[PDB]
Design a protein around this ligand. Structure first.
Ligand SMILES: CC(=O)N[C@@H]1[C@@H](O)[C@H](O[C@@H]2O[C@H](CO)[C@@H](O[C@@H]3O[C@H](CO)[C@@H](O)[C@H](O)[C@H]3NC(C)=O)[C@H](O)[C@H]2NC(C)=O)[C@@H](CO)O[C@H]1O
Ligand SMILES: [Cl-]
Ligand SMILES: [Cl-]
Ligand SMILES: [Cl-]
Length: 129
């Protein structure tokens, strides 16, 4: 599923991401835009052998199990393929764990390099939320 911008904003807000760990909704929408282009099916391999999965590009070295990432944790206790569903529930629940783990949203490289410090409220412009 390729979410619309406001469509994703509303789903993220319903699941309690708006202001989760102090990160406003626009931060999460911006992160998803630059991580996955709003595409729940997005997958990208990393140089360390791990892969990033789904709308928020959750990594198989720490957070989900894909069976092919040696010496990896599965801290969200979920198969990585479950993070590709059109329903974002599993990605959101896992993202809540990630953002609580110490570094905040700096866990998302695209957030750090493209959203952090910018006018993220623009990502929810026009949305009825
Ligand atoms: C969205 C996503 O999957 N992002 C991935 C990052 O999570 C990952 O970065 C590493 O994440 C781990 C787990 O959060 C970091 O470990 C934590 O580090 C802090 C101190 O900085 C400490 O308080 C925590 O206890 C510790 N958690 C543990 C050990 O479970 C680790 O520092 C991150 N590493 C780096 C280089 O940022 C990166 C890299 O694997 O991948 C993203 O896709
Ligand atoms: Cl915002
Ligand atoms: Cl891939
Ligand atoms: Cl923080």
């Amino acid at each position: 599923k390729v979410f619309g911008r406001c469509e994703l904003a509303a789903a993220m807000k319903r699941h309690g991401l708006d202001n989760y760990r102090g990160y406003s909704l626009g931060n999460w929408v911006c992160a998803a835009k630059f991580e996955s282009n709003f595409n729940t099916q997005a997958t990208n391999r990393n140089t360390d052998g791990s892969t990033d999965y789904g709308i928020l590009q959750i990594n198989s070295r720490w957070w989900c199990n894909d069976g092919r990432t040696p010496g990896s944790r599965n801290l969200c206790n979920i198969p990585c393929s479950a993070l590709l569903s059109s329903d974002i529930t599993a990605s959101v629940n896992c993202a809540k764990k990630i953002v609580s783990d110490g570094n905040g949203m700096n866990a998302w490289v695209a957030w750090r390099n493209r959203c952090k410090g910018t006018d993220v409220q623009a990502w929810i412009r026009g949305c009825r939320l």
